[PDB]
Amino acid sequence: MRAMRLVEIGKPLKLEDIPIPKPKGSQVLIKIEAAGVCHSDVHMRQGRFGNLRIVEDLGVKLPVTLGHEIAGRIEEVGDEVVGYSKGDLVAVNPWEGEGNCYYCRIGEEHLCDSPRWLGINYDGAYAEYVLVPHYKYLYKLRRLSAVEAAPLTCSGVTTYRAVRKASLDPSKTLVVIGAGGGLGTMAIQIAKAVSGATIIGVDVREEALEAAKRAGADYVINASSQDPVSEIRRITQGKGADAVIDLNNSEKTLSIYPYVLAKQGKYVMVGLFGADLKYHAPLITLNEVQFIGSLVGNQSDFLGIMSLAEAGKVKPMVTKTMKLEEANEAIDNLENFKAVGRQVLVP
Template identity: 45%
Template sequence: MKSARITRTHEPLEVQQLDIPKPMGPQVLVKVNSSGVCHSDIHLWDGGYEGLDGQLLKTTDRGVKYPLTPGHEISGMVEDLGDQAEGFSKNEKVIVYPWIGEGLCPACRSGEENLCDKPRSLGIYLDGGYSEYVLVPSYKYLVKISDELDMDAAATLSCSALTAYGAVKNAKLKPSDNVVIVGTGGLGLMAIQLARAVTGARIIALDIDDDKLKTAKESGANDVINSKKEDPVKAIMKLTNNLGADAVIDFVNASKTVETDMEFLRRRARVVLVGLFGGELKLGLVSVPTRAYRLIGSYTGTINDLVELVSLTERGVIKPVISNRFKLEESTQALTMLKEGKIIGRGVIKP
């Protein structure tokens, strides 16, 4: 089988010929139809994340090993099953839940494998979906989808939509709330759709790109603000009658964006940090208890959340925005375009 692999950080991915794995026990072999291109893949390609004082937090220090086949947003067809795999048949359409835990930590035992102490996620710690086939460790990580659901859109549910859904849930939005969505790429657009459909809150989208903001408006944002062209703090305070935002979901999560977030918060506001851009934040600590802010980190979602997302998508409540499709040989181009901000919505690789 052909797989696009990161063999060295910062260098073009290599398309290699590998043996097709044979599933054993509860394992399932999935023939990949689509694999979403995610910002997390860029961090794997770069070899790390920006930490405090600009220091690189290396992926290898987190247990990532190269060469690696990235890709954790995977849709496809069941190709083969181990002798202990149940509930699925060859050629069934599925989405893969990639956030696999070791099964024994408190998070895993409570159904939150995405927050496992020793994660084994596909496309990060195990070979993923930039490949013609992917070996899934157990049938329990598969979710069936209907024949009517677009396979490209379905792939993005397991990270882009799942991460957005988890963030919206963590924001605990009410219909009377004003929520600011910072960053209107693929995740931000999905969060706008979900917040509108599930919570009824008033949505204010914040970005520096007019084209992305136009798409955000079309996706359901009530108001949009280009922070390059106007002061976002003044604009948000004006929109909220000088009360401030009840919640912020920051899909960038860089020093500058979070510093700005803290300037337009209402008392009791929730700040949900999702993006992995990195940096550091200086806080006036007295204001945290006196204004009762809540700073919340949000990382993907549970497999039950994914099942809910499939239902929402199949009923047309949400519609993932697929803007770019790439061949396996174009994986480096896909990552480069995403890194340069040239993908509006979500890109997928089609092996």
């Protein structure tokens, strides 16, 4: 089968011909009908998340098929599979754990000590087929097509979790940094659907802000032409933002936004652009500010976002559908900040 794999860092993904997995036990073989392209793949290709080398520090073993936004039809199931039949259209939660470690026992499976992340350390969706370790990570689709559902397995579940960590309510204001991109449009839609908080979207491209508005942002700020700090201060009437979901965490964003937080404000750090957070400690203490890391999501988060989308409350903004072989072009678009919403590959 065809597969776009990461064979060497700093080099484009290579199309290869590898065997189709054979499911056994509780595993499930899925024929891919949609594979979303995540900016995280830009970092993977470069082989690094900030100062962290995926191979040397994170333990990734090359080669590996990328693609962690997965949706397709069940092709074959193992002998222990129950409640799923061949032909079923499903979305797949790639953030899988083994079950015995501390993090799996408390329901934080994505933080497993021996993680099975499809598309990162295990073969992902940039292929004609993908082997899913356990059927419990599936979610049958009815209202959504594979193309519309795929982005939900990463950008969706990730921002759903981040939005929960933001602890929103009607009296609070949320600021999303990078609001026109893949996770940005998803975070905005979700915040608009599961809370009554005021949503402010921030980006640097005119097209990105149009995307943020289509996503439902109550207010948008172009940080290239406008003074983001002044605008956020004005909109919140001098109070500052009660929560900020930073989908960049770059030298640029971390030098600006951590300073527009209201007292008790929560700065949820999702982006992986790579930079150090330098912040005066007394500022953290005296203002009870919080810097919170958020990574993908657990089974509850996956269930939550899938339920919301399947109910028609939110829907990924897929702006382009391309071939599996165009994987390197889709990733380039993100690397060059030329895409809005989400791009999805179809084998």
